[PDB]
Amino acid sequence: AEQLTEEQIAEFKEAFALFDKDGDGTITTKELGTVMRSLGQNPTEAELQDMINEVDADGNGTIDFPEFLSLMARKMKEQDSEEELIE
Ligand SMILES: C[As](C)(=O)[O-]
Ligand SMILES: [Pb+2]
Ligand SMILES: [Pb+2]
Ligand SMILES: [Pb+2]
Ligand SMILES: [Pb+2]
Ligand SMILES: [Pb+2]
Ligand SMILES: [Pb+2]
Incomplete structure (x- = not known):
C-alpha cells in the first residue's frame, strides 16, 4: 500500500551491489551466475540471459x-496484496 521508501531503496542498493561486484551500475549474466551458485544453483550461460x-x-x-x-x-505489491487477503 506504500511505495518504496528512501531507506528501503538504500537497502536495495546494497543488495544490487552484491550482484554488481564491479559497481558499474549493471548486473550481467556472469555476475548473476556468481550469485546463483552462492545459493546452491547452477544455471546455464544462455539460461542466465533469459533471467x-x-x-x-x-x-x-x-x-x-x-x-x-x-x-x-x-x-x-504482491506480498502486500496477499497479506491483506490472509485476513
Ligand atoms: C496504506 As496507508 C499507511 O496510506 O493508510
Ligand atoms: Pb500512504
Ligand atoms: Pb527511519
Ligand atoms: Pb543495510
Ligand atoms: Pb556489473
Ligand atoms: Pb537494462
Ligand atoms: Pb532501464
Missing part, C-alpha cells in the same frame, strides 16, 4: 538499478 531479459526492461542486455527496483516494487 536477465526477464527483468531487463530497456532490453539493453543487463539489469540496471531502476529495473531492479521495479521488480522489488512488484514483489512488495
Whole structure:
C-alpha cells in the first residue's frame, strides 16, 4: 500500500551491489551466475540471459538499478496484496 521508501531503496542498493561486484551500475549474466551458485544453483550461460531479459526492461542486455527496483516494487505489491487477503 506504500511505495518504496528512501531507506528501503538504500537497502536495495546494497543488495544490487552484491550482484554488481564491479559497481558499474549493471548486473550481467556472469555476475548473476556468481550469485546463483552462492545459493546452491547452477544455471546455464544462455539460461542466465533469459533471467536477465526477464527483468531487463530497456532490453539493453543487463539489469540496471531502476529495473531492479521495479521488480522489488512488484514483489512488495504482491506480498502486500496477499497479506491483506490472509485476513
Ligand atoms: C496504506 As496507508 C499507511 O496510506 O493508510
Ligand atoms: Pb500512504
Ligand atoms: Pb527511519
Ligand atoms: Pb543495510
Ligand atoms: Pb556489473
Ligand atoms: Pb532501464
Ligand atoms: Pb537494462
